[PDB]
Symmetry: D3
Subunit: 144 residues, 6 copies
């Protein structure tokens, strides 16, 4: 079980806690092969979740949740854990807002499973910050 595979396995696993059915996304922040924070797609802690009260629609989009990647950063902010010089493992490549936040927090590498359209501006930013992005599949694993 390789380190890369373990972290993607974990991204996949925490994505399963997503509480807005329009997106199951998971994210894992890693420093020297340790998990230091994780996120999934869900509403503000101790507020309503889409699963229970329905989506918060605006402009044909649901806006209730904090994204998985942003949630991982906000865990670090909340708990006072350093995100600097970490790397992230995500089920889906991040939106441009999340990317900007990840790069600003000092995330040095992004490994993703799926990706649909990567923002060119996200690619420009990653180039300037010398941050690599690399696809890797979720390992086939069975537990229980």
């Amino acid at each position: 079980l390789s380190w890369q595979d373990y972290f993607m396995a974990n991204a996949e696993l925490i994505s399963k806690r997503s509480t807005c059915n329009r997106a199951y996304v998971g994210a894992v922040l890693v420093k020297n092969n340790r998990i230091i924070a994780t996120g999934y797609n869900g509403g503000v802690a101790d507020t309503d979740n889409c699963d229970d009260v329905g989506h918060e629609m605006e402009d044909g989009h649901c806006i209730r949740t904090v994204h998985a990647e942003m949630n991982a950063l906000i865990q670090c902010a909340k708990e006072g854990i350093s995100a600097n010089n970490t790397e992230i493992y995500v089920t889906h490549f991040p939106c441009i807002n999340c990317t900007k936040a990840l790069l600003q927090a000092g995330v040095k590498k992004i490994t993703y499973n799926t990706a649909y359209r990567i923002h060119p501006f996200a690619i420009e930013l990653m180039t300037q910050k010398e941050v690599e992005y690399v696809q890797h599949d979720v390992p086939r694993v069975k537990l229980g």
Copy 2:
């Protein structure tokens, strides 16, 4: 000079460092009357700023910058400084995205200089998180 005036003063002050001339915004995160982090409206660190290379326009707004409030939070995440049970002073009441993140981070009070229209969804979230929001003016001070 009151604590409230000191912090709003420093919000205004940091707002001036904004590097996108479409919005001068400043944010000050505070725990037990100490400034623990600040943000202004700016592009990702060590990348191009609008002041230098122009705006990054999309659907009519500039997407180059991280917002001041988000930047303050990302400082906490990057440096591993706890934002839990803090309050924030902002020159402008936050967008819904920033509001979500501040609340997720454990911010318990938002003091703002100018608010324009507070999103009903933001009022709902703040109600559920029992977060106080209050207008306060930038004090008149002359330095030098």
Copy 3:
């Protein structure tokens, strides 16, 4: 996917990285539903593992490895991460030595997949430290 299932799942998962084929053990330390540290059954970092150079046998058992539970604790010590008032998820209920250390470290709950015979001395210590111990199964999950 429940919090309990998520953590036991991740215990099983990290257990697979064990580098001594006589015991596959995994440990997950948790504070406020965040993973703060993990351990597996392995030799001292940057030294020989059994997988590569054989076991270090003595009086009929291998002494090369640090146990998974102890490794999780040592991660906390090495990195200066607080293990106080945490809980742990382990694939196997800990030996008496590990039990002592977890309790000394401030661990307040032990959730285990398989326990075999819990030492009477361990029951005494857990009673005095008011530490709960509870069996929970590895959930059935397929990844990929």
Copy 4:
């Protein structure tokens, strides 16, 4: 009063708090000539001590206590103080279990007063981790 002598003086001194009369052992973790944690030979905090209720005998050995060296590491784990890149001062050279834990926590040097039989495997591990072990006497000091 040399730094080496001060730390050994301290090891000796904290060994005096040992609550199992079958071993008076003291340990001091040091980073840049500062004491960051200490340990002595005693049972789990807030549980019974040998001094009061008798030894916990098994296999002709007392197993009630956490060793001094392990207690120093567990203080770091408990309080979230980093043991990485520290050095330790101990009254007696550590057993193999303790040695493995010390090396795993990033302890870089071991200075001991007495030593009886050093485990060859402990010597192999110390060689591989490039960790030196050096005898030094307790200074003759009188206070009061």
Copy 5:
């Protein structure tokens, strides 16, 4: 608005909270262009202030307050924030006691607005510690 100017602006601003009218002094500790602690001239927190009960005179001097510079260091001590490798911005160059404390805490540079008589011993200490001291004016800024 330059970084130097922003920090001096802040020193000036926090000096305005001074609660002994015989000295309005402000100090700002900075690490990588972030404010990590500030101080002003005032009595021990939660004790009487000169503004309310009068000065504490001894030897023709008021001795009630902790100096601004020392208060900034003591905030770091109190809150457990590292002052090592910081730089300080102060309205007035520090007395010799404060200077010794600043250099001992690892402050690497002192930028001051006014200065009356710099202690030669302070200059000797700054030379030995390779710490530069540099005058800079408070920027002319108007808010509100």
Copy 6:
């Protein structure tokens, strides 16, 4: 060997490292019966000590050194170790300046070996901060 005797013993012990022969002072900061910082009477780190280059006399006293109690506090500031809600053990009851700083730092108890005349202003401050002060002797111990 009691906790109180252990700490006073270590105050005496560190006092011996003083590098100004006009005063041998030692300070030990303690949180939950752990030593978190110590100070002795000494010049700024990596500068000249009196032992080597003579005293720095002014108005009849030596001003070269940082006092032991202040040094203990500055260790906390430098290293980012929290001195809040600690207690201190000192060989001599502190000067008024040190008293102010300890109290500002959140020290809640002063245990001292020798006090000579406690400043009325110090009694006032300690009363307002509800800080206990208590005499305790250096225990008789012989090491080696």
